[PDB]
């Protein structure tokens, strides 16, 4: 059953690599969007200060 | 868990064949 | 998984045990 071996590894290797990468890639996108939220907070504070 | 639906069948065949033999071996007298 | 690991071994055991039964029974029969 070469297929069980192909599947046992394909399931794990293709997914752990692609999936964990999406977790951290998006974590950075999300952190940047969170920075945008901070920058909007900053923008709101600056408009009020002016 | 299709990997083991398939492993199950393989082991099922291995035991069924060993079992077929256990039964025959006893049946043969 | 414990259930899979163990019950796969149980199916392997049906083979191992059935095979031992087949071999001993056939040796005598």
PDB file of N, CA and C in Angstrom, chain C residues 6-29:
ATOM      1  N   UNK C   6      -4.022   0.232  19.683  1.00  0.00           N
ATOM      2  CA  UNK C   6      -4.336  -1.002  20.331  1.00  0.00           C
ATOM      3  C   UNK C   6      -5.170  -1.922  19.500  1.00  0.00           C
ATOM      4  N   UNK C   7      -6.170  -1.403  18.808  1.00  0.00           N
ATOM      5  CA  UNK C   7      -7.044  -2.292  18.109  1.00  0.00           C
ATOM      6  C   UNK C   7      -6.397  -2.727  16.796  1.00  0.00           C
ATOM      7  N   UNK C   8      -5.488  -1.924  16.253  1.00  0.00           N
ATOM      8  CA  UNK C   8      -4.721  -2.398  15.126  1.00  0.00           C
ATOM      9  C   UNK C   8      -3.897  -3.547  15.614  1.00  0.00           C
ATOM     10  N   UNK C   9      -3.303  -3.414  16.811  1.00  0.00           N
ATOM     11  CA  UNK C   9      -2.558  -4.528  17.337  1.00  0.00           C
ATOM     12  C   UNK C   9      -3.492  -5.680  17.598  1.00  0.00           C
ATOM     13  N   UNK C  10      -4.731  -5.436  18.007  1.00  0.00           N
ATOM     14  CA  UNK C  10      -5.619  -6.566  18.211  1.00  0.00           C
ATOM     15  C   UNK C  10      -5.903  -7.289  16.911  1.00  0.00           C
ATOM     16  N   UNK C  11      -5.926  -6.584  15.785  1.00  0.00           N
ATOM     17  CA  UNK C  11      -6.206  -7.249  14.528  1.00  0.00           C
ATOM     18  C   UNK C  11      -4.938  -7.970  14.096  1.00  0.00           C
ATOM     19  N   UNK C  12      -3.784  -7.374  14.417  1.00  0.00           N
ATOM     20  CA  UNK C  12      -2.514  -8.018  14.154  1.00  0.00           C
ATOM     21  C   UNK C  12      -2.466  -9.268  15.007  1.00  0.00           C
ATOM     22  N   UNK C  13      -2.984  -9.195  16.237  1.00  0.00           N
ATOM     23  CA  UNK C  13      -3.045 -10.326  17.139  1.00  0.00           C
ATOM     24  C   UNK C  13      -4.010 -11.339  16.651  1.00  0.00           C
ATOM     25  N   UNK C  14      -5.133 -10.943  16.068  1.00  0.00           N
ATOM     26  CA  UNK C  14      -5.949 -12.009  15.554  1.00  0.00           C
ATOM     27  C   UNK C  14      -5.103 -12.752  14.539  1.00  0.00           C
ATOM     28  N   UNK C  15      -4.308 -12.038  13.732  1.00  0.00           N
ATOM     29  CA  UNK C  15      -3.436 -12.736  12.808  1.00  0.00           C
ATOM     30  C   UNK C  15      -2.367 -13.547  13.503  1.00  0.00           C
ATOM     31  N   UNK C  16      -1.676 -12.974  14.479  1.00  0.00           N
ATOM     32  CA  UNK C  16      -0.570 -13.659  15.131  1.00  0.00           C
ATOM     33  C   UNK C  16      -1.054 -14.864  15.895  1.00  0.00           C
ATOM     34  N   UNK C  17      -2.193 -14.727  16.551  1.00  0.00           N
ATOM     35  CA  UNK C  17      -2.748 -15.774  17.361  1.00  0.00           C
ATOM     36  C   UNK C  17      -3.360 -16.818  16.477  1.00  0.00           C
ATOM     37  N   UNK C  18      -4.064 -16.388  15.428  1.00  0.00           N
ATOM     38  CA  UNK C  18      -4.661 -17.328  14.521  1.00  0.00           C
ATOM     39  C   UNK C  18      -3.586 -18.060  13.803  1.00  0.00           C
ATOM     40  N   UNK C  19      -2.501 -17.374  13.505  1.00  0.00           N
ATOM     41  CA  UNK C  19      -1.438 -18.021  12.823  1.00  0.00           C
ATOM     42  C   UNK C  19      -0.790 -19.010  13.757  1.00  0.00           C
ATOM     43  N   UNK C  20      -0.562 -18.646  15.025  1.00  0.00           N
ATOM     44  CA  UNK C  20       0.027 -19.623  15.920  1.00  0.00           C
ATOM     45  C   UNK C  20      -0.897 -20.821  16.061  1.00  0.00           C
ATOM     46  N   UNK C  21      -2.219 -20.584  16.084  1.00  0.00           N
ATOM     47  CA  UNK C  21      -3.144 -21.693  16.175  1.00  0.00           C
ATOM     48  C   UNK C  21      -3.070 -22.518  14.925  1.00  0.00           C
ATOM     49  N   UNK C  22      -2.975 -21.873  13.767  1.00  0.00           N
ATOM     50  CA  UNK C  22      -2.901 -22.601  12.524  1.00  0.00           C
ATOM     51  C   UNK C  22      -1.683 -23.442  12.455  1.00  0.00           C
ATOM     52  N   UNK C  23      -0.565 -22.888  12.886  1.00  0.00           N
ATOM     53  CA  UNK C  23       0.668 -23.608  12.805  1.00  0.00           C
ATOM     54  C   UNK C  23       0.698 -24.755  13.777  1.00  0.00           C
ATOM     55  N   UNK C  24       0.235 -24.549  15.007  1.00  0.00           N
ATOM     56  CA  UNK C  24       0.268 -25.665  15.917  1.00  0.00           C
ATOM     57  C   UNK C  24      -0.753 -26.697  15.541  1.00  0.00           C
ATOM     58  N   UNK C  25      -1.936 -26.250  15.142  1.00  0.00           N
ATOM     59  CA  UNK C  25      -2.949 -27.197  14.827  1.00  0.00           C
ATOM     60  C   UNK C  25      -2.555 -28.006  13.642  1.00  0.00           C
ATOM     61  N   UNK C  26      -1.992 -27.364  12.615  1.00  0.00           N
ATOM     62  CA  UNK C  26      -1.572 -28.011  11.386  1.00  0.00           C
ATOM     63  C   UNK C  26      -0.409 -28.933  11.661  1.00  0.00           C
ATOM     64  N   UNK C  27       0.477 -28.534  12.572  1.00  0.00           N
ATOM     65  CA  UNK C  27       1.603 -29.376  12.923  1.00  0.00           C
ATOM     66  C   UNK C  27       1.105 -30.714  13.454  1.00  0.00           C
ATOM     67  N   UNK C  28      -0.005 -30.687  14.194  1.00  0.00           N
ATOM     68  CA  UNK C  28      -0.588 -31.901  14.733  1.00  0.00           C
ATOM     69  C   UNK C  28      -1.618 -32.534  13.787  1.00  0.00           C
ATOM     70  N   UNK C  29      -2.268 -31.697  12.982  1.00  0.00           N
ATOM     71  CA  UNK C  29      -3.356 -32.028  12.078  1.00  0.00           C
ATOM     72  C   UNK C  29      -3.022 -31.699  10.622  1.00  0.00           C
TER      73      UNK C  29
END
